[PDB]
């Protein structure tokens, strides 16, 4: 319907759940620059319903921090115009939870490479 | 106080306002890799109180989209451990607001280069 199309949220405003997983919302994981690479099959399947999602979302920037911390660019190409973003979120290596944080992030980074 | 230090929100969870501007929350704009580059004097002083902040924040990803779209990695340097992120958000060049979106975004990308 036109109303569903007219109010459909863009990629960056979507939220992945069990009813609408990471693949459906943000495409398949892959190595291409246009593709996401984060998440094991559980996180793919469950999205924000993932058990350890609050431990991952603690690293996601707020809207203000996204435009405050990141390096923002504009790419105007014949195939379209893009808002590009790059940045880094510093962990606290002295936090008691630091070792568990590194393990949790590593388990989901490029996890699609193990997928049988 | 210890309670203020123990509950102090990290950089990615902060929100810039007139009472806590972009420089205070996220550091001065600059060319370095861990420096933000986005915002003119107005947005820098006003943060989310900026008149056109909703039109900027429409491009900021949700927590799920941040980890769903971006290429996520982890760097370990003598300074610490970092969660790196890169990505791109396509603009709709057929949207009636597209021309205004590009002008507003280019007004803030590397706006500090022209600061007196």
């Amino acid at each position: 319907s036109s109303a569903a199309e007219a109010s459909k949220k863009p990629r960056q405003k979507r939220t992945a759940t069990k009813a609408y997983n990471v693949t459906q919302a943000f495409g398949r994981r892959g190595p291409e620059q246009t593709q996401g690479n984060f998440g094991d099959q559980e996180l793919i399947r469950q999205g924000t319903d993932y058990k350890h999602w609050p431990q991952i979302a603690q690293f996601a920037p707020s809207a203000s921090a996204f435009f405050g911390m990141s390096r923002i660019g504009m790419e105007v190409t014949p195939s379209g115009t893009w808002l590009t973003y790059t940045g880094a979120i510093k962990l606290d290596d002295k936090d008691p939870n630091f070792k568990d944080q590194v393990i949790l992030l590593n388990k989901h980074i490029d996890a699609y490479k193990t997928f049988p | 106080s210890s309670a203020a230090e123990a509950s102090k929100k990290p950089r990615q969870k902060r929100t810039a306002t007139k009472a806590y501007n972009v420089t205070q929350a996220f550091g001065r704009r600059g060319p370095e890799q861990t420096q933000g580059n986005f915002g003119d004097q107005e947005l820098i002083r006003q943060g989310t109180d900026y008149k056109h902040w909703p039109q900027i924040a429409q491009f900021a990803p949700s927590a799920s989209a941040f980890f769903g779209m971006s290429r996520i990695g982890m760097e370990v340097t003598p300074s610490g451990t970092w969660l790196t992120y890169t990505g791109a958000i396509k603009l709709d060049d057929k949207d009636p607001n597209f021309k205004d979106q590009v002008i507003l975004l280019n007004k803030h990308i590397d706006a500090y280069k022209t600061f007196p």
Partner: antibody
């Protein structure tokens, strides 16, 4: 001066018929879908019907489907609601509202920012 | 049919922050829109696409989205803000048009 002016409301008996009209000005009327939205006395807003920019496609809420017919005259920049088989629960203020823009088909919507001031329909014996 | 749920009434004192919520299963996929209506008047758009203000709307109006719930926030609420507020969205299935929430009466205790 973007503006929508409704008329045609009145008192009618159950089973009767009314024709509402909504005159538009200040915008390219023929480029937009237009909707009717009603509000029973002391009740909430209920979307009723929509017609697309060219008048080719129409859709209706289940509460009025088969009884109301929406139409438009782009040469007159006017929107109509033909109300047949009126029921007592059709008593409401009927609002004309600008709906989504369509370009060539993509649909662009930024809320119903333009409303008429409403016309009152009373279905009573 | 697709339905949006909002509280029937919210009470606030002047200067406080009024919050009106609206929930629906398709809100993670579909934008919401907020309307303010005073008695005897037509509704007025105050927030579109979850969080954007039309040009004439005061800055104290704001909106946010958290999954299946959107929240209309009015900071430093004034007596002029006492009204009925309606959220609006669409099902993601693509077989229907706009649906309104049941509406929230915001009382500003002056």
């Amino acid at each position: 001066e973007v503006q929508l002016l409704e008329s045609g409301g009145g008192l009618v008996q159950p089973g009767g018929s009314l024709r509402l009209s909504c005159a538009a000005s200040g915008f390219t009327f023929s480029s937009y879908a237009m909707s009717w939205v009603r509000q029973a006395p002391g009740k909430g807003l209920e979307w009723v019907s929509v017609i697309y920019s060219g008048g080719s496609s129409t859709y209706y809420a289940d509460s009025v489907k088969g009884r109301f017919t929406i139409s438009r005259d782009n040469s007159k920049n006017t929107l109509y609601l033909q109300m047949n088989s009126l029921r007592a629960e059709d008593t409401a203020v009927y609002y004309c509202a600008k709906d989504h823009l369509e370009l060539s088909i993509n649909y662009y919507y930024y809320g119903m920012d333009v409303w008429g001031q409403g016309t009152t329909v009373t279905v009573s014996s | 049919s697709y339905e949006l749920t909002q509280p029937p009434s919210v009470s606030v004192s002047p200067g406080q922050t009024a919050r009106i919520t609206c929930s629906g299963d398709a809100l993670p996929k579909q934008y919401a829109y907020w309307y303010q209506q005073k008695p005897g008047q037509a509704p007025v758009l105050v927030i579109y696409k979850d969080s954007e203000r039309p040009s004439g709307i005061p800055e104290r109006f704001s909106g946010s989205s958290s999954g299946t719930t959107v929240t209309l926030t009015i900071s430093g609420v004034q007596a002029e803000d006492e009204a009925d507020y309606y959220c609006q969205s669409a099902d993601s299935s693509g077989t229907s048009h706009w649906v309104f929430g049941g509406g929230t009466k915001l009382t500003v205790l002056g």
